[PDB]
Amino acid sequence: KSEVLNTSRLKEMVNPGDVTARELNQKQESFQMTATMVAASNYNFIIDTTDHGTWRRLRHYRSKVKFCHNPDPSNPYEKKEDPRFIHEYIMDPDCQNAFFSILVYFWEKLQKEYNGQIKKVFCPTIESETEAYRKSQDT
Amino acid sequence: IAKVIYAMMGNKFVVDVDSNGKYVWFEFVLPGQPMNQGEIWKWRKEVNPDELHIYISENFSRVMDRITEHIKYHLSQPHESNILNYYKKLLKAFERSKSKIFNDSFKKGVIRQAEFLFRQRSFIQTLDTNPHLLGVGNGVLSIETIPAKLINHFHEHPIHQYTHICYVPFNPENPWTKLLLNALQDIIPELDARLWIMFYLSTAIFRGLKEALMLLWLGGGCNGKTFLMRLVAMVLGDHYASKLNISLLTSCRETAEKPNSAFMRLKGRGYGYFEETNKSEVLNTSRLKEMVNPGDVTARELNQKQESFQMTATMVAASNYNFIIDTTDHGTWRRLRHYRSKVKFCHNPDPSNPYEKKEDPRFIHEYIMDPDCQNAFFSILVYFWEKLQKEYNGQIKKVFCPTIESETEAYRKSQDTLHRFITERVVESPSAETVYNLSEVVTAYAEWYNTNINVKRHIALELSQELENSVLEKYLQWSPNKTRILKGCRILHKFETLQPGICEPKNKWWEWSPNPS
Amino acid sequence: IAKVIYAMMGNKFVVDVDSNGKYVWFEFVLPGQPMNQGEIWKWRKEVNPDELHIYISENFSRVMDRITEHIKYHLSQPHESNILNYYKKLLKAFERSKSKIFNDSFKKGVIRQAEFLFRQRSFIQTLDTNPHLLGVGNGVLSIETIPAKLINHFHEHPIHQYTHICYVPFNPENPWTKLLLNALQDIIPELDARLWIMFYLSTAIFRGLKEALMLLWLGGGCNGKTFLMRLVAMVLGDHYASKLNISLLTSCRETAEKPNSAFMRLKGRGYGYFEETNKSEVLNTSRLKEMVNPGDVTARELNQKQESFQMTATMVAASNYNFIIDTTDHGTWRRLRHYRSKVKFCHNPDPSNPYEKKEDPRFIHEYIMDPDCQNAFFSILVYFWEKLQKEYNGQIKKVFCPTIESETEAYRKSQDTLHRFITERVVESPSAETVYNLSEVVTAYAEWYNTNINVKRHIALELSQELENSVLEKYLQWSPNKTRILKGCRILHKFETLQPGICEPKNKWWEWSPNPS
Amino acid sequence: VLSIETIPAKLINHFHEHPIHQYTHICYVPFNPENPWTKLLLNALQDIIPELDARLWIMFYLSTAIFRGLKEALMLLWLGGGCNGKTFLMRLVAMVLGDHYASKLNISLLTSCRETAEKPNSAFMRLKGRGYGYFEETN
DNA sequence: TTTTTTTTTTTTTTTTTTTTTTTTT
DNA sequence: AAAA
Numbered sequence A: 001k002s003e004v005l006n007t008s009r010l011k012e013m014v015n016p017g018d019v020t021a022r023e024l025n026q027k028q029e030s031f032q033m034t035a036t037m038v039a040a041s042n043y044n045f046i047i048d049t050t051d052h053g054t055w056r057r058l059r060h061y062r063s064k065v066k067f068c069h070n071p072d073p074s075n076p077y078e079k080k081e082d083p084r085f086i087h088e089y090i091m092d093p094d095c096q097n098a099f100f101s102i103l104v105y106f107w108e109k110l111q112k113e114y115n116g117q118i119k120k121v122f123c124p125t126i127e128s129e130t131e132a133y134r135k136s137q138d139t
Numbered sequence B, C: 001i002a003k004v005i006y007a008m009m010g011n012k013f014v015v016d017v018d019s020n021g022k023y024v025w026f027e028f029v030l031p032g033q034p035m036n037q038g039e040i041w042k043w044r045k046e047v048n049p050d051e052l053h054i055y056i057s058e059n060f061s062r063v064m065d066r067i068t069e070h071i072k073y074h075l076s077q078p079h080e081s082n083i084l085n086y087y088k089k090l091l092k093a094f095e096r097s098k099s100k101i102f103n104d105s106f107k108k109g110v111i112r113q114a115e116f117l118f119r120q121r122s123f124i125q126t127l128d129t130n131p132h133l134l135g136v137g138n139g140v141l142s143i144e145t146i147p148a149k150l151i152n153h154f155h156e157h158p159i160h161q162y163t164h165i166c167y168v169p170f171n172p173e174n175p176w177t178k179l180l181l182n183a184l185q186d187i188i189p190e191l192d193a194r195l196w197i198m199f200y201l202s203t204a205i206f207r208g209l210k211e212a213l214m215l216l217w218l219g220g221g222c223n224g225k226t227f228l229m230r231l232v233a234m235v236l237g238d239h240y241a242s243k244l245n246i247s248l249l250t251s252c253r254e255t256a257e258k259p260n261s262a263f264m265r266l267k268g269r270g271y272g273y274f275e276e277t278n279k280s281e282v283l284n285t286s287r288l289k290e291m292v293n294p295g296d297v298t299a300r301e302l303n304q305k306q307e308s309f310q311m312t313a314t315m316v317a318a319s320n321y322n323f324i325i326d327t328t329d330h331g332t333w334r335r336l337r338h339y340r341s342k343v344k345f346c347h348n349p350d351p352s353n354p355y356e357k358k359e360d361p362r363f364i365h366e367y368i369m370d371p372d373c374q375n376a377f378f379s380i381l382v383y384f385w386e387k388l389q390k391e392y393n394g395q396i397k398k399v400f401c402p403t404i405e406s407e408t409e410a411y412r413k414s415q416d417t418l419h420r421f422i423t424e425r426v427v428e429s430p431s432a433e434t435v436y437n438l439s440e441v442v443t444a445y446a447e448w449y450n451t452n453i454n455v456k457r458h459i460a461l462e463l464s465q466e467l468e469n470s471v472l473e474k475y476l477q478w479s480p481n482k483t484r485i486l487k488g489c490r491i492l493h494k495f496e497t498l499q500p501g502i503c504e505p506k507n508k509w510w511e512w513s514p515n516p517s
Numbered sequence D: 001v002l003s004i005e006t007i008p009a010k011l012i013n014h015f016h017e018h019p020i021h022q023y024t025h026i027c028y029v030p031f032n033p034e035n036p037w038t039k040l041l042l043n044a045l046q047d048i049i050p051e052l053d054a055r056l057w058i059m060f061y062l063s064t065a066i067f068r069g070l071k072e073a074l075m076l077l078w079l080g081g082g083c084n085g086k087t088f089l090m091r092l093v094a095m096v097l098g099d100h101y102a103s104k105l106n107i108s109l110l111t112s113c114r115e116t117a118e119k120p121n122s123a124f125m126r127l128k129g130r131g132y133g134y135f136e137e138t139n
Numbered sequence E: 001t002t003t004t005t006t007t008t009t010t011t012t013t014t015t016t017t018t019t020t021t022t023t024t025t
Numbered sequence F: 001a002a003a004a
């Protein structure tokens, strides 16, 4: 369901800096994280803060397609599921090869255009959906 | 010597490095050698190659004597000063080396050296990967093609796990098979439900990817569900079937990350069953969807590091108490199935109780100890899986059964506290309006099922939208301050008042009948 | 050398690999050698074959001497130039090899080499598996056929565990047997109950699958329960009996924490007992029915992995505090039997108290360390087991005893909080209408026994169906809003105002009397 | 080694065959009331407990501490106040008997209020072979 | 209830081996 | 000087 969270080890992983913590059964060595984070859910996240910096390093979106097994013409923002589309199509290595090619091509496009600055690109939906969250989530 | 031995008996031994970095020897079993029951025509794990140790001391001696004989024969023929000293020195050195093969330190060194020669890269991780091969007492059974082929001869399949249940082709004429079929028909009266449940159970033989379906059905207190669960688990074997904790799904409790030996279960297993519950159990997403979907999952080796094991076993949960489900998502209530039994065995069965019969006290205490019973059950399961493959091509969701998915949807119409409150307290009484942002309604609903159903921590936002996920939002506009105030209801308390506002099989049912069945 | 040794005395030793992957040595004990008490005619576990080391260093010497005579005897007879050098060289080589056996490094390698020759596959897991064989002080006891036969000579039974109680044929004329029979009869005045209890205790000697039955009996505060409980365990031995903690059966709800050692009892133990409790306590748990049933169970013990073992033992729970039973499962009630003691030994026994006698201070403090007491008592139990097999063919449920199952069913009519409340506030006062939905009846029933009986987490199921599982459903309808509103009755919390609306044996009882008895 | 098998007790200071290994470092001598220490202890002991019958009964109970076999189930607890000298008597016996046969256990154990689940417990141990257990004051 | 006990080591080679120079062929 |  919906989850409540605020700065609870949030900014420590948000920033590209360095943190450190328990290492299984040891003390620590170092944590230089470089991985992109994504958190998709069907329940609204509860945030209770007004820090400008936290909202600065945040993005929000909301998809509008909810496929149905009985899709009528009156439902434009949904279609028919393919049960095998998730159950299979991942086992075929050719699918991963094609997806990897797509990812490499898109990364090269990003490097060519905005030179590695993800925030340099402009998307009307992006930020707008994020500031919409800012407009919300404020008791 | 290691090279000679590898060239000599090298097709029978395989050495591979374990997960801990220790070399392990595997032996290929053949008839006519000391062995455990049911371990024929397939590989086994060996601590040290003992029979290789006796082999290097027994069989190599004949080759040694052949070399000695050849040397002596060459010495016999007339020659020149070469046989004066060279042949004699070779004979002396070879004689001194002959006894070396018997030395224990020498033998250990030879074995350690030949570990590298017998090394075969990429062997452990490809063990039991084929799901169409199942280990059996009389060899290996292949279900890749219909009909399934029993292999009792030489092969090259990487099969090591097994069960000690000998396999025979499905023979309905067997007395034990007929008795089991009749008993199974009696336990579940409906033909269509019987067939559907048997087809679902036959999927436990397979070990590959399967459709994400969960079976959970109710039954009588003395129904006999646990008999079927224990029988299936016994027939499949420990390596493929294991008894998981019913509460596990009901209560996620500690995270999988937290040391869990049950998390090390479901790895390679083909069966996991839930025991009877002492009472009704509530569960929702408490490691539910993780066990539901067939995707690969991690593997927390108790206190050790975090592995990843693929899960494919069939999960079944049987109880005499219902289970509390608190959710509305269609996806969760689309990979579940429900059924209810109707047989409550009695030791004084009057004619006025057709939906029950006399117990057999020895039906559970014994009748599992007979190996013939497991053979018959295994044949039945194999035959049913073959029938499913023939008809629906492995698609369990494709088979139709009217009584099933009807009890399931009936259960879906139940186990919904929100609808009870709706068509108990507000519906049929819309002729008023008292709503404080539905917050009063949320609190009333919460306290209502706190005493009515159960007490638990609440979140205001869960009903902030679930109210619109009902028939309540038929009249809900909002004030200038929004507040989404409902436009009609009546908060009712106490008594108040009503204020204005299938076909029976002919002789055989295992024959499945034609496609309509 | 190892080949010669195995061909010479190889039948006396067996080498098998343990579960941990370490070779283990087993020696068969024969009379005429040192041994621990009660370890005759059966296999024993030995870390190092010490008797073998002295055997290869002493007994093997004479075989060496026979070689020494043979070579010189052939040397004595005149021959050609072969005896000039051949016999001389071999004799020098052999005498050099003579002293090699007395070396230590040489002997270590011999033992390691002989581990392959003496290896016997599938030997540990088939040890102590036959339930009809019991290790006794004077050999091994077989209860396969009536009468039970004691084997005290050579055999091939794979038996390793034992108890140190020497067996003698049952003699009722023995003074210890006479005293034990008299005291035991006085302990339980009822003949039929005495017959029923002894038969149940007789199954403890068995080590195979048994009828699922739980014994618990009540009575006097100082009856003498622990005397009989201690005697059976002491006689039947530690290897087959264990002290079981009551907290395991009375754990709150959790199945097990990640390690568990107490539950790993009953692995080979054929008997476990439960003692007096601090106070009346509830025991309705998962283990209430999970442990009692003959189905196999699995658990983990710390470093030991999470394996399974068949529960094979008889459970008895004697106390003076009545156990709080709260369930409606007829299956659970099947496993349980109840009895009440009626003897309270007193230090001032007057004739006006026939249901008691004088204590014997030395009855428990001593009379146990005497081996003859154990031998006589064990004979009594063994005789009973043969007798029970003769009459009821080893079926404990089919034995008849009028006083048992009568006090038990009277106990069943108790420990029913709901039924007690039924004829307390609503029944006998049905002429009113003050019954809302079942939630209010849940609350009303909850608050009653909250102080009258105990506090408990009142979940919905306690009356969501028990209303139909009662006598109050005769008038149970639902409104247009459903709600299952009862037709109503005088709830009337509290009770204010009125409510409107055997045969004594002649001289011997172990003779059991004829079949009716 | 001191033998209490037969009356009177006999001391073995020569060769024998009894498998005994544990001991205490207190030398044994025949009981002589004429020793100044024997009189000194007896006088103080007599003053500690005034009643003759109680004095006899208590010390007869404590005399069983030498024995190491099975004993009748008797629990002795008694009340005092202030500097009553109770600690003196328990402490004297413990060292006299020695650690191999006497030991001190947590007073909480006596309370029995604490309950132990499936978990290691050490204070329950140490009672093997001993013949004397003494406690102290509580909160 | 982790917690710390449990785990998990943790000795792991070591001796030896060979030679051994002398001896005695 | 080479083999034990």
Ligand SMILES: Nc1ncnc2c1ncn2[C@@H]1O[C@H](COP(=O)(O)OP(=O)(O)OP(O)(O)=S)[C@@H](O)[C@H]1O
Residues within 6 Å of the ligand: B182, B183, B184, B186, B187, B219, B220, B221, B222, B223, B224, B225, B226, B227, B276, B345, B358, B359, B360, B361, B362, B363, B364, C331
């Ligand atoms: N086909 C059958 N013919 C004869 N007896 C049967 C048959 N099927 C079941 N029984 C008996 O009826 C009972 C089966 O129901 P139960 O086993 O009591 O129900 P359950 O689901 O197994 O829960 P349990 O076993 O009570 S914990 C057993 O006593 C069986 O021996």
Ligand SMILES: Nc1ncnc2c1ncn2[C@@H]1O[C@H](COP(=O)(O)OP(=O)(O)OP(O)(O)=S)[C@@H](O)[C@H]1O
Residues within 6 Å of the ligand: C182, C183, C184, C186, C187, C221, C222, C223, C224, C225, C226, C227, C345, C358, C359, C360, C361, C362, C363, C364, C365
């Ligand atoms: N048949 C008998 N003849 C003589 N004395 C007996 C007999 N049976 C029991 N006693 C004695 O009477 C007492 C038996 O009752 P209790 O021992 O007080 O009750 P209990 O169930 O044994 O509880 P505990 O464990 O002994 S405190 C013991 O002192 C026995 O020695």
Ligand SMILES: Nc1ncnc2c1ncn2[C@@H]1O[C@H](COP(=O)(O)OP(=O)(O)OP(O)(O)=S)[C@@H](O)[C@H]1O
Residues within 6 Å of the ligand: D043, D044, D045, D047, D048, D080, D081, D082, D083, D084, D085, D086, D087, D088, D137
């Ligand atoms: N028999 C005795 N002869 C001489 N002095 C004694 C004797 N018994 C007790 N005392 C004195 O009284 C004191 C003993 O009392 P305490 O040991 O203080 O009290 P307790 O009851 O043993 O427990 P504490 O120590 O007060 S918590 C010592 O300081 C002794 O000097």
Ligand SMILES: [Mg+2]
Residues within 6 Å of the ligand: B224, B225, B226, B227, B276
């Ligand atoms: Mg059952």
Ligand SMILES: [Mg+2]
Residues within 6 Å of the ligand: C223, C224, C225, C226, C227, C228
């Ligand atoms: Mg007792």
Ligand SMILES: [Mg+2]
Residues within 6 Å of the ligand: D083, D084, D085, D086, D087, D088
């Ligand atoms: Mg003091």
